[PDB]
């Protein structure tokens, strides 16, 4: 009956560590990817239904969908992150599995371009993330029935928003939902390889830490940096 998301869930503000370094810097790429990962998880924690599920269930959910959540965030933040510049630099350090990583990079580029071409807005991205977060398809979850109802509310709220905001674009909702399968064509293992493993990082292991961290000290350090 009541809504899954509020207008508060539209805000998704990534702070990059600095302007693009002159030369390939793996630390800058991973720091930027890690800020996006932290923001995606801190955004999920802001949803009342997510908090209501409890720590066991909501850790299992993120462990199952983090790569899809993270990739929607890559598409949303592509301009802010200069993602096109970052992917080019990885392809070159690569070219100077190998061919798996290349196909993955190509899939990520095509996904990010498909979302830009549709002008996906902040509301549409929040609902798309909620639809991937509350997917009942994953074999781990315990409480399929309740997660299914949360996913159905996200779908209904996205349709109402698209009908109210883009009334003349009859086919927009269908166009946006047919982007979601593209997220599952991208291996979480390769995302981890491309943006994290190197700096030695299992995302599955650190997810519980990110979900429990106090965000005040973290956000102060991010915002108070040069």
């Amino acid at each position: 009956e009541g809504p899954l998301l509020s207008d508060t869930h539209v805000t998704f503000k990534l702070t990059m560590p600095s302007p693009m370094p002159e030369y390939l810097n793996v630390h800058y790429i991973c720091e930027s990817a890690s800020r996006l990962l932290f923001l995606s998880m801190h955004w999920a924690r802001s949803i009342p239904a997510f908090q209501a599920l409890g720590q066991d269930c909501n850790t299992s959910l993120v462990r199952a969908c983090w790569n899809e959540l993270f990739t929607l965030g890559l598409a949303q933040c592509a301009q802010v992150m200069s993602l096109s510049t970052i992917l080019a630099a990885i392809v070159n350090h690569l070219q100077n599995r190998i061919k798996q990583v290349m196909e993955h990079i190509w899939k990520l580029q095509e996904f990010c371009n498909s979302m830009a071409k549709l002008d996906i807005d902040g509301y549409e991205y929040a609902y798309l993330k909620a639809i991937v977060l509350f997917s009942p398809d994953h074999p781990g979850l315990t409480s399929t029935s309740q997660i299914e109802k949360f996913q159905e509310k996200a779908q209904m709220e996205l349709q109402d928003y698209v009908q109210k905001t883009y009334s003349e674009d009859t086919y927009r909702l269908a166009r946006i939902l047919v982007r979601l399968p593209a997220l599952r064509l991208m291996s979480s293992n390769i995302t981890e390889e491309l943006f994290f493993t190197g700096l030695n990082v299992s995302i599955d292991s650190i997810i519980p830490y990110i979900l429990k961290m106090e965000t005040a000290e973290y956000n102060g350090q991010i915002t108070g940096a040069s």
Partner: peptide, 23 residues
């Protein structure tokens, strides 16, 4: 202007804690 590796420093702490706790 200059990067502060805030998120990397948290991840380094999380990794270190998880390795102690398991294996």
């Amino acid at each position: 202007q200059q990067p502060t590796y805030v998120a990397l420093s948290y991840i380094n702490r999380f990794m270190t804690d998880a390795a102690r706790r398991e294996q």
